[PDB]
Design a protein around this ligand. Sequence first.
Ligand SMILES: Cn1cc(C(N)=O)c([C@@H]2CCCNC2)n1
Ligand SMILES: [Cl-]
Ligand SMILES: [Mg+2]
Ligand SMILES: [Mg+2]
Ligand SMILES: [Mg+2]
Ligand SMILES: [Mg+2]
Lengths: 194, 194
Amino acid sequence: KQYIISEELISEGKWVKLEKTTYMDPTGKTRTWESVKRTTRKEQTADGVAVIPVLQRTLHYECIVLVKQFRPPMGGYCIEFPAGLIDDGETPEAAALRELEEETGYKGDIAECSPAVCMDPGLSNCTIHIVTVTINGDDAENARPKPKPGDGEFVEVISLPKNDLLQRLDALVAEEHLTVDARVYSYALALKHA
Amino acid sequence: KQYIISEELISEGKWVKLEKTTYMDPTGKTRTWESVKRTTRKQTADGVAVIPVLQRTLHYECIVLVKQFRPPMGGYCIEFPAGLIDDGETPEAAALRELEEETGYKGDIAECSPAVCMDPGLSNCTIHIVTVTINGDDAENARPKPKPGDGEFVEVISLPKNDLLQRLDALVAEEHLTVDARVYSYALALKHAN
Ligand SMILES: Cn1cc(C(N)=O)c([C@@H]2CCCNC2)n1
Ligand SMILES: [Cl-]
Ligand SMILES: [Mg+2]
Ligand SMILES: [Mg+2]
Ligand SMILES: [Mg+2]
Ligand SMILES: [Mg+2]
C-alpha cells in the first residue's frame, strides 16, 4: 500500500545527510518524513556489520566479546558489539572478521550472517548485517589478542560470560558513566528470558 | 580521556538535526564527527521499545511485533512496539501506552532497562527496553483494540518465542521486509542461549 514518492536533500555532510521524504499513506494521502542517511553506501547490502563474537575456550564458560569506545554523538563511552562499515567490494563476512580483528585482536570463524537489519528505521535508512562469529580461544593466534586500531580508533575490549551477561552489563553501568548498546542489551535480555 | 569540546549546528529540521561535533581524542588531538540528534528530548531517553511476551495457556508463548512502512527505509519493517516518551511520562507508562496504541494489548511491566543507545556512531538516540507480559487469557485482551495516532498504520504480527529467528527469516525471505536490529538480536540470543 505505502511507497516513496520523492526524496529531497535538505543538508549533505561528508558522512551523513538529512532528506525530506514524501510518501503515500494507506488512506491515499501524501505525507512527509525527515530522514537520515549515510553518504557512504554504494553497492553494499548494508551500511555496516556488527559482530556477535562468541569466545570459546576449553573449561571456560563461553564469553561475548564487546568493545568500549568514546562515541562523539553520545558524548561519552558506549559498550557495543564490535562493528564497522563495510568497505566497497567487501562482503559482510569479510567486514565482520576484519573489524573483529582490528577492534579486539581476535581471529574469528564465521558462524552465521543475518540479512540486512535496520538500525533505527524511524530515523534513518541505516542497516547492518549481524554476523555471529566463534573465536577459538585455545588457538595460539588468539592467545595474545592485540587490537589493531586505525587512525582515530581507540578501543577497549570487554569479554563477559554469556551465562551472566545482563547482570554483568548492569554491574558495569552501575560502576561508571557509560551506555550499553540496545542490540547488546536485547541480546542479553533474550539470554535471560531463555 | 575523551570528551566533547563543542558542537556546530549544521542543519535543524522540525524532528531531526545534523551537528558537527569537535572532540578530544585520547592522544590529545582534536577531531571532528558528524552526528545526528532528535529535537524532541526533554527525559530519561528518547523512546521506549516494548518486548511484549504474549502468554496464553495451552499455546506457545509469542512475542508481539509490529509491521509498519518506514519512510527512511522506503519499505516495511518488523519491530518491537515502540514510540517516543511524552514529556511527563515515565518509561514504564510510555511502554504500556505504546503497546496498547500499537497492538491493543494491555500489559504488565516485567522489567525496564536503563537508557541504551540506538546507533552511537551516528546519533545520540536512546531508548528504554521494557519487557512486558500480556495475559492473553484475560477478557481485556480477548479482542485487542489497536488505537493509532494520526498517520500511524500498524499491523500486528505475533510470533512464537521458541522459533522466533526461523520465523523472522521466513518473513524476510517471503515478503521483502526488514527486521529491526534489536528484534533480530533478541531472536539470535534466544537460539544461542545455553
Ligand atoms: C559520522 N561519521 C562517520 C565517519 C567515518 N567516515 O568514519 C566520520 C568522520 C571520518 C573522518 C574523521 N572524523 C570522523 N563521521
Ligand atoms: Cl518474560
Ligand atoms: Mg567500529
Ligand atoms: Mg573499526
Ligand atoms: Mg511506533
Ligand atoms: Mg505509538
